[PDB]
Amino acid sequence: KPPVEKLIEELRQLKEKAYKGGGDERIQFQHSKGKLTARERLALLFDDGKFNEIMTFATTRATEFGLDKQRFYGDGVVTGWGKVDGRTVFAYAQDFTVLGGSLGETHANKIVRAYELALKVGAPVVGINDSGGARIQEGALSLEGYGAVFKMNVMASGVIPQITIMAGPAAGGAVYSPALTDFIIMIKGDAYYMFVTGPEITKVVLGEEVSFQDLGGAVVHATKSGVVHFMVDSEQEAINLTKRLLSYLPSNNMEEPPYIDTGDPADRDATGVEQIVPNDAAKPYNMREIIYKIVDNGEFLEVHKHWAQNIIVGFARIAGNVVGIVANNPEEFGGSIDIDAADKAARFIRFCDAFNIPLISLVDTPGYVPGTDQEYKGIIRHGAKMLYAFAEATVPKITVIVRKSYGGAHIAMSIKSLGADLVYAWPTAEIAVTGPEGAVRILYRKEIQQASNPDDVLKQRIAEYRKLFANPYWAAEKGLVDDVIEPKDTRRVIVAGLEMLKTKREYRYPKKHGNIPL
Amino acid sequence: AARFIRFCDAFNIPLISLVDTPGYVPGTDQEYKGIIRHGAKMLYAFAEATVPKITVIVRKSYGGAHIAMSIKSLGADLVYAWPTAEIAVTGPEGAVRILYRKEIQQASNPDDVLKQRIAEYRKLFANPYWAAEKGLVDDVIEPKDTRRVIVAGLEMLKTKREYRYPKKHGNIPL
């Protein structure tokens, strides 16, 4: 083999073969088979004209079970880095056409190398999952592989943003790396499912055979389990959303979130946000409409939109700077916080704090969801997570009480003693040690029965308590709230608060970590 | 286990894992209540931890649960296995099921093969020696030595120091 011009030609042939991921039948079975190929997903995700793929030809070293038979350059996963809206982002994309996107030892080591490079230079990692699980043929070595990926996920946790696009049939080990990341974007009709244990070990423990698509699918994890943060109906929408999610996040924990507008129409508001809240204190309203008039162009990327809807969590921008919002939702469970809600908010809060994203709390909550069901499932420890998340956080934190704020939930939404930097309240704010009714009863236990009607006093007591305490001015007089303000001022007020808090630095006791309730 | 792990690590208490687990409890109830994110907490807790960590597999450790009890790639410092240890990518049956299709309904043999190949696989894989030959376990040991081994291991690891990436904190699943 002497010619060089001939060698460059053979290189082209080899790479052309490697790109097919084994199966010019399979990949060609790409543009009308339901899903896109690993490479096609990567083409959509990256600007593409400046980057590199690593370990392109790396193959499995296992021999057992005919693994010596096949080659498959890359061993089932494409790893490397690129540009997304001009920012460096690492990524891997498993190729289902190669042994069911099975996780081989080499396949795992490519994902790990990717994570190592990303960690070294402070770049986000996007995992486009499309794997059925462990590569059975490689035995315990496949489990070692998973273990190595997981360890990287934990090392990268809170250091670099980790986003996973669940675009395949994940089972067993395949579900845990995504769980360790910060956000899971899953397709409903273009990607399909994820579960620890398959229907097989249980289908002889009941009796219903669930064909294929979305069994323990997206709908289940996005509305019931809370494992999925965003559910989309397409792979194109899955990648588009990834880009949009990346745009609100910094590249690492050493950088401030991106300012992509940096425009400051913060000057002022005049879109009567006060009309949103009903004159009647018992009537609901869409809290999202309030965040719309507060944030730039009304934009808001909601996280966990279809899970634990009693609280709202998501990203937006104020004066061009990204903010994280945690707001009670009056349209679901009367705005009461839940076990799911508490979990939803707690993780969003810690994530925001880890990546230096200011936190804005919009409050209207009567308390927690009552019930032996909640207590039995441990609302006591799940609810404590929010208290921990806020207290732990050092990012700028501002609370705006729009309406109700009672008892423990009042505290969980972030108050001064818990570490709130600034607390504001609308004239409609109502802070109370507990629900007025609940407070009046105990506060007059013996009376209420020594008058002229066991129901009379619950007015001269319930309505009077609200007039003398169900207001923002009692807490304001005690210095618990910094100020009471006109609803239309909220944006200008948040703008000035964040601007001043911009260079906030606090203190924390040295520890390997804490022990938040799980 | 996750919270116990994190608490011990935070207060410098060595961690000893004693393994015998087939995997996770199946069913919609578990999946619906998010076993995926809860299960991940153990993986995080162990990987996170820097105190001395030693694993002793007494019997089985299959699939994901095998990893969650702490393996070397996840950060275990030392891994030992009793002669009875049985480490597998998944339950041997579930494994054999897959690894022997294309020959389970095509072979001129009815259905007694699933039990034979299930037994061969266990004899061929369900043994500490395969993992030990791959460097996955440091050694296979005589049950009665478990104490001596943990003692030596802890004595040596007592001055252990690892290295962690600077961060305000992490984002373990909740």
Side-chain angles (χ1 to χ4, degrees):
Chain A
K1 176 66 281 179
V4 176
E5 308 257 284
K6 177 72 280 179
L7 289 171
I8 61 83
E9 298 183 298
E10 302 173 0
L11 172 55
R12 294 171 172 165
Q13 315 186 319
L14 274 46
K15 280 189 175 174
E16 185 183 8
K17 171 188 177 185
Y19 293 169
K20 293 297 186 181
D24 192 358
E25 189 189 292
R26 272 57 305 306
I27 76 276
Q28 238 37 49
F29 170 58
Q30 64 198 311
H31 289 302
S32 295
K33 66 87 119 300
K35 328 198 304 196
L36 296 174
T37 60
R39 289 185 178 288
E40 299 175 311
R41 290 164 174 171
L42 288 179
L44 287 166
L45 173 62
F46 292 94
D47 308 337
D48 225 349
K50 286 284 291 66
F51 74 120
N52 174 63
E53 176 180 0
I54 69 169
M55 307 181 89
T56 300
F57 299 98
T59 58
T60 175
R61 268 122 79 153
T63 52
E64 292 161 348
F65 292 107
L67 285 188
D68 186 302
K69 165 283 164 186
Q70 57 82 180
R71 191 159 226 56
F72 298 130
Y73 288 118
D75 195 39
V77 61
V78 182
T79 63
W81 78 93
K83 291 286 188 61
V84 179
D85 292 317
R87 306 165 69 195
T88 297
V89 173
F90 275 75
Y92 66 78
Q94 308 176 288
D95 191 327
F96 191 79
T97 70
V98 172
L99 307 170
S102 198
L103 200 109
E105 167 176 289
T106 295
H107 170 142
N109 287 334
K110 284 180 64 169
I111 290 177
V112 167
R113 183 56 188 161
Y115 263 104
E116 288 179 351
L117 281 169
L119 258 181
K120 281 182 192 300
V121 312
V125 171
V126 174
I128 306 175
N129 294 59
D130 188 359
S131 176
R135 185 174 295 172
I136 317 310
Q137 308 90 313
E138 284 185 38
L141 280 178
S142 181
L143 299 190
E144 276 299 301
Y146 269 126
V149 179
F150 299 168
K151 197 180 190 309
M152 291 296 88
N153 292 138
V154 178
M155 235 73 282
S157 197
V159 177
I160 272 179
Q162 308 177 74
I163 299 167
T164 148
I165 293 178
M166 180 61 259
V175 311
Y176 286 141
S177 178
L180 291 167
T181 61
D182 309 301
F183 295 97
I184 293 182
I185 297 178
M186 195 179 157
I187 306 84
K188 188 180 67 188
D190 264 9
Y192 266 142
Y193 58 87
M194 59 190 296
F195 39 69
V196 173
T197 311
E200 25 279 76
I201 96 159
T202 12
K203 61 183 181 179
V204 186
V205 191
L206 75 197
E208 333 77 358
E209 309 60 89
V210 210
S211 191
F212 64 147
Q213 52 90 294
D214 286 289
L215 217 164
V219 174
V220 161
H221 294 128
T223 68
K224 289 171 181 172
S225 84
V227 171
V228 166
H229 302 79
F230 307 88
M231 177 170 66
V232 297
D233 299 317
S234 175
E235 293 196 7
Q236 289 71 28
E237 287 167 53
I239 56 91
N240 279 165
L241 181 47
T242 299
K243 300 181 182 178
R244 184 185 179 187
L245 177 48
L246 271 308
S247 74
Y248 285 97
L249 305 183
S251 301
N252 51 261
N253 70 341
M254 292 294 113
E255 284 165 45
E256 271 56 45
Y259 323 70
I260 190 176
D261 185 350
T262 303
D264 302 338
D267 299 17
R268 205 56 190 57
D269 186 12
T271 185
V273 58
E274 71 289 314
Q275 303 306 308
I276 303 302
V277 174
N279 287 316
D280 183 353
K283 268 76 278 188
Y285 57 88
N286 177 194
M287 174 68 91
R288 291 188 186 69
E289 297 198 298
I290 290 187
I291 99 83
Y292 298 150
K293 327 225 84 166
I294 302 177
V295 308
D296 303 355
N297 306 325
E299 270 237 301
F300 182 56
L301 181 54
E302 203 177 338
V303 180
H304 270 144
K305 186 173 187 181
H306 296 119
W307 186 56
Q309 306 186 285
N310 36 319
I311 51 84
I312 301 161
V313 139
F315 305 105
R317 281 173 190 286
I318 298 181
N321 296 131
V322 320
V323 308
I325 300 172
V326 188
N328 311 116
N329 181 350
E331 306 183 318
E332 292 298 324
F333 296 168
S336 290
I337 139 78
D338 207 7
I339 61 303
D340 288 9
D343 279 350
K344 173 165 169 180
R347 190 130 188 275
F348 176 72
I349 286 161
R350 298 193 79 229
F351 174 85
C352 283
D353 175 70
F355 294 99
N356 321 99
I357 294 175
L359 281 160
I360 294 175
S361 288
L362 296 185
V363 189
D364 189 19
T365 184
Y368 296 83
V369 177
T372 209
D373 195 14
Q374 285 288 306
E375 286 294 328
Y376 280 22
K377 289 166 58 177
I379 174 62
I380 291 176
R381 61 191 165 91
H382 289 83
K385 298 175 181 176
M386 284 180 76
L387 299 165
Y388 187 106
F390 270 129
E392 168 180 72
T394 57
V395 294
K397 293 170 302 192
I398 300 176
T399 303
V400 178
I401 298 168
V402 3
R403 205 196 215 177
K404 301 182 294 294
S405 199
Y406 308 159
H410 167 243
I411 310 172
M413 285 306 278
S414 187
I415 64 176
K416 286 187 175 182
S417 54
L418 194 72
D421 294 301
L422 265 10
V423 185
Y424 297 92
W426 285 11
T428 44
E430 197 177 316
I431 99 289
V433 64
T434 185
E437 172 170 330
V440 170
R441 281 171 165 294
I442 173 176
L443 235 36
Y444 297 74
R445 171 78 310 92
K446 46 64 245 300
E447 288 177 57
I448 267 181
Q449 55 96 327
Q450 308 194 304
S452 303
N453 195 318
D455 304 321
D456 84 286
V457 26
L458 291 188
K459 212 295 177 176
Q460 161 57 221
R461 260 45 191 153
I462 212 167
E464 181 182 62
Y465 186 82
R466 300 172 67 77
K467 224 108 64 182
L468 289 68
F469 310 105
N471 64 184
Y473 310 102
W474 186 86
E477 284 199 24
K478 302 305 182 182
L480 310 189
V481 310
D482 292 295
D483 196 34
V484 183
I485 184 52
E486 305 195 11
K488 79 180 188 303
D489 286 337
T490 71
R491 178 184 169 73
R492 98 83 201 313
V493 172
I494 298 312
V495 171
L498 291 178
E499 211 263 313
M500 171 268 166
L501 296 177
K502 190 77 173 182
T503 56
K504 176 190 185 192
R505 299 201 68 53
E506 209 149 57
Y507 175 42
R508 301 138 313 290
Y509 278 82
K511 69 183 71 173
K512 300 183 188 173
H513 52 76
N515 186 38
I516 181 176
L518 298 179
Chain B
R3 191 127 190 272
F4 180 73
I5 296 301
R6 299 196 76 215
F7 178 87
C8 288
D9 174 60
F11 292 96
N12 322 302
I13 296 175
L15 268 34
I16 295 174
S17 290
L18 296 182
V19 195
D20 184 11
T21 185
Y24 292 80
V25 177
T28 61
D29 191 50
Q30 285 292 304
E31 291 295 340
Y32 280 29
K33 292 223 60 191
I35 175 57
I36 293 171
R37 62 189 163 93
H38 293 85
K41 295 176 188 174
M42 281 177 82
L43 297 170
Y44 184 111
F46 266 134
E48 174 182 63
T50 61
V51 288
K53 295 172 294 177
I54 304 180
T55 301
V56 180
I57 300 176
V58 2
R59 199 151 81 171
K60 50 202 177 303
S61 63
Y62 306 156
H66 163 71
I67 304 167
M69 288 303 282
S70 188
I71 60 179
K72 294 212 281 185
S73 54
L74 194 79
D77 296 300
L78 265 16
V79 176
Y80 295 101
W82 284 11
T84 43
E86 179 179 353
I87 132 72
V89 61
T90 190
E93 194 179 272
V96 172
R97 235 53 181 279
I98 284 63
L99 294 177
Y100 292 100
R101 199 187 92 190
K102 329 302 302 301
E103 182 212 296
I104 227 65
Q105 308 117 297
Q106 200 58 163
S108 296
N109 295 52
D111 303 301
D112 271 302
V113 299
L114 179 275
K115 276 303 300 73
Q116 195 169 54
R117 303 308 257 294
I118 212 172
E120 170 171 295
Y121 184 80
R122 294 174 70 92
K123 189 62 48 51
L124 145 153
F125 269 28
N127 59 70
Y129 309 108
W130 184 89
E133 282 192 22
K134 301 305 183 189
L136 278 41
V137 311
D138 295 306
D139 201 23
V140 184
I141 187 188
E142 284 194 37
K144 66 178 179 179
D145 290 323
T146 300
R147 184 182 166 72
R148 290 192 176 78
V149 169
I150 299 304
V151 172
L154 289 185
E155 159 267 348
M156 177 274 285
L157 296 173
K158 160 162 290 189
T159 51
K160 175 190 184 188
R161 279 108 46 177
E162 200 92 358
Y163 8 114
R164 294 322 192 206
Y165 283 98
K167 70 183 73 176
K168 285 188 184 181
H169 50 71
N171 190 33
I172 178 177
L174 294 179

